């Protein structure tokens, strides 16, 4: 038998890309197709938002003078906020912004180990000439979908749900390979969809790492 290898990662855009696996025998395109699709949607390490403590706010179901938006819409906007962390397993981010205008992703106090990926992602609009927000955004690692109720203290600490999944949409396509003097061999092409927080070769390598650990369990 043969073994496939990486020939290309077509970085087609900032968000997503396509990789290529080649060569393969019969069924293994479909086998690793359904397999690696299912693993990539299954479980990758995530870097979601965890909880947010905005300053003058008792609780999520109230307002704040100086912003057009409710609190609720704000933190659901933060639920989609993507970010990249390297050296830690949890970190606390901080934003301070006054003046009339939209609140972008740029206004956080960035560090060298954390890295936002989409600077344009809006949060809210300040409408007052002199009002500000000052929240502290706790961010940690994780894996999977974790609601806020299934976990486990001061009242300013609001909560969110956890969506520890960098991936969005996985598609794979088999076709024949163009091998030297041989047929019946297969080019696997995989299209992933990433928010921007995970490099592809790392992703599939982690996936097959998990899959080897799972075939490990009996032989």
């Amino acid at each position: 038998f043969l073994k496939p290898r990486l020939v290309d990662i077509e970085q087609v855009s900032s968000t997503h890309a396509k990789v290529t696996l080649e060569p393969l025998e019969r069924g293994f395109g479909h086998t690793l197709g359904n397999a690696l699709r299912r693993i990539l949607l299954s479980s990758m390490p995530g870097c979601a938002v965890t909880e947010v403590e905005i300053d003058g706010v008792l609780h999520e179901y109230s307002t704040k003078e100086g912003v057009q938006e409710d609190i609720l819409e704000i933190l659901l906007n933060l639920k989609g906020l993507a970010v990249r962390v390297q050296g830690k397993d949890e970190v606390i981010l901080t934003l301070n912004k006054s003046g009339i205008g939209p609140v972008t992703a740029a206004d956080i106090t960035h560090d060298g180990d954390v890295e936002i990926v989409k600077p344009q992602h809006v949060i809210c609009h300040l409408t007052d000439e002199n009002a500000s927000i000052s929240m502290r955004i706790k961010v940690q690692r994780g894996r999977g979908y974790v609601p806020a109720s299934t976990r486990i203290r001061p009242i300013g600490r609001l909560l969110v749900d956890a969506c520890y999944s960098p991936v969005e949409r996985i598609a794979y396509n088999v076709e024949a390979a163009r091998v030297e003097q041989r047929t019946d061999l297969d080019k696997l092409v995989i299209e992933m969809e990433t928010n921007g927080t995970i490099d592809p070769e790392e992703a599939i390598r982690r996936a097959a790492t998990i899959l080897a650990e799972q075939l490990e369990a009996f032989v």
């Binding site: 949607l41 949409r169 299209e191």
Partner: protein
């Protein structure tokens, strides 16, 4: 005969759970049966889940 009344507003968030009634606009009722993970959905060649 009462001295003071204290009203308390309590606020609940409710998501969804297997056993809820949810329906379209054609008399097509339904009780939601199984919240089944993403990977088991049908999906097109483009890759989008239903």
């Amino acid at each position: 005969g009462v001295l003071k009344i204290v009203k308390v507003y309590l606020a609940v968030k409710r998501r969804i759970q297997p056993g809820d009634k949810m329906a379209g606009r054609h008399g097509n009722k339904g009780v939601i049966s199984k919240i089944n993970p993403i990977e088991d959905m049908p999906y097109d060649e483009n890759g989008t889940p239903v």
